[PDB]
Amino acid sequence: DPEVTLLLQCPGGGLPQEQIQAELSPAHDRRPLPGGDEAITAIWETRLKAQPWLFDAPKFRLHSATLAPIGSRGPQLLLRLGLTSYRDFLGTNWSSSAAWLRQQGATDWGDTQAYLADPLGVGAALATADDFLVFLRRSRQVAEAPGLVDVPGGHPEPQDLAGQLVVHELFSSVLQEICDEVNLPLLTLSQPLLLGIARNETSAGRASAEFYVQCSLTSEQVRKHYLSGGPEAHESTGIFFVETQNVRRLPETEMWAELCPSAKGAIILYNRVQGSPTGAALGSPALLPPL
Ligand SMILES: O=C(c1ccc2snnc2c1)N1CCOCC1
């Protein structure tokens, strides 16, 4: 799967909010382009002169994420974050020249991402009370990954002593994206666990935080809530469900070729961190079938 790379696999079945620190610093921002940020401005101007209803928005930038030694007490993860924007994304990661910016970053800074916006996404492996994961079909008319399968999520917009508010907004935003797109009540959702971070190599290495969220409703009830919004209540064109039993072998199915890279990230991390039992009971051959 060359279109997805794992940057972080979380320990202990995934990390709760209270075990994560963030450092939000201009030291973690994109570097100005070698010939100046005028190239980003020119692309934006061309875009607005064709689609003048478009608007810019701020985004978090992932610089890096450092895990503590396993088995330790105290904070278990440090997220190094800067700030970027939708405009900077359109002029760098989404640019036809994105691979040239990666080579220049290697040359100038020893960092393939130095000249990339790299806005941080969020996504969820969302499980039902009857043990299914939730999938969404993307419109065939959108610019990114048309007609492919996705999981719930988005790209959160800003607003340890400003850090804890930032971690709070990241955990909040994955629940908000589930309530807005799937139309579920907030009180049917668990507190999220962070499974890990996955990079989209088809979009020049931009990264998504991937979470595990449990719903107290069954697959049939989740479908009812999704549909009862009507076609205007969601960006996706349909919802469907796969037994957690069958998610284990999903990369061997015809569905895999239809998953967008960030949804592949969410399913690989679910299989590694929530699947793959470590103990004698769940590891027994009748509960963990060979092959
Ligand atoms: O939701 C998104 C979107 C896509 C990529 C990124 S990367 N940073 N934030 C993003 C936001 N879009 C694009 C514009 O039209 C509506 C759908």
Give the residue among 59, 50, 45, 52 at the shortest CA–CA distance from 89.
Answer: 59
* CA distance linking residue 188 with residue 217, whole number of Å: 7
Could you tell me how many helices (H) and strands (E) the chain has, helices first? 8, 11
Dig out the tokens for 142 from the structure. Answer: 């959108």
Give the residue among 194, 214, 198 at the shortest CA–CA distance from 206.
Answer: 198
Residue 77 host element (H or E) = strand 77-85
| Cβ-based neighbour number of residue 226 at 10 Å | 19
- Contact by Cβ (8 Å): 243, 128: no
* CA distance linking residue 189 with residue 179, whole number of Å: 9
DSSP string, 21-50: EEEE-GGGSPPPPTT-THHHHHHHHHHHHH
Q: What is the Å distance from ligand 1's center to 230 Cα? A: 22
Q: Does the beta carbon of 47 lie inside 6 Å of ligand 1?
A: no
* CA distance linking residue 288 with residue 291, whole number of Å: 9
Tell me which residue has tokens 């890990």. Answer: 196
Strands 20-24 and 77-85: parallel
Cα angle for residues 121, 127, 128 (degrees, 5° grid)? 140
Q: What are phi and psi of 184, to 5 degrees?
A: -90, 145
Residue 285 host element (H or E) = none
For residue 233, give every residue at least 6 positions away whose Cβ sits within 8 Å of its Cβ, in sequence order, or none: 183
Does the annotation place 226 within a ligand binding site? no
* CA distance linking residue 274 with residue 9, whole number of Å: 11
Report the 3 state secondary structure along 103-139.
HHHHHHHCCCCCCCCCECEEEEEEECCCCEEEEEECC
Ligand 1: nearest atom to the Cα of 154: 1
- Which residue stretches of 92-218 are H helix? 98-109, 163-182
CA 122 from chain centre, in angstroms, equals: 3
* CA distance linking residue 26 with residue 4, whole number of Å: 27
Q: What are phi and psi of 77, to 5 degrees?
A: -145, 140
| Cβ-based neighbour number of residue 241 at 10 Å | 16
Q: What is the Å distance from ligand 1's center to 78 Cα? A: 26
Dig out the tokens for 138 from the structure. Answer: 């993307």
Q: Name the residue of 144, 150, 206 whose CB sits within 8 Å of the most ligand 1 atoms, as the mutation to test its pocket.
A: 144
Using CA atoms, how far residue 111 sits from 101, 102, 104, 185, 279, in Å, is 10, 8, 9, 42, 40
Q: What is the Å distance from ligand 1's center to 20 Cα? A: 26
Structure letter (DSSP) for residue 78: E
Residue 222 host element (H or E) = helix 219-228
Q: Does the beta carbon of 119 lie inside 6 Å of ligand 1?
A: yes
Q: Which approach determined this entry?
A: X-ray
Question: Would you call 70 helix, strand, or coil by DSSP?
Answer: coil
Question: Would you call 184 helix, strand, or coil by DSSP?
Answer: coil
Nearest 10 degrees: Cα torsion 215, 221, 223, 228: -110
- Which residue stretches of 78-195 are H helix? 86-91, 98-109, 163-182
Residue 250 host element (H or E) = none
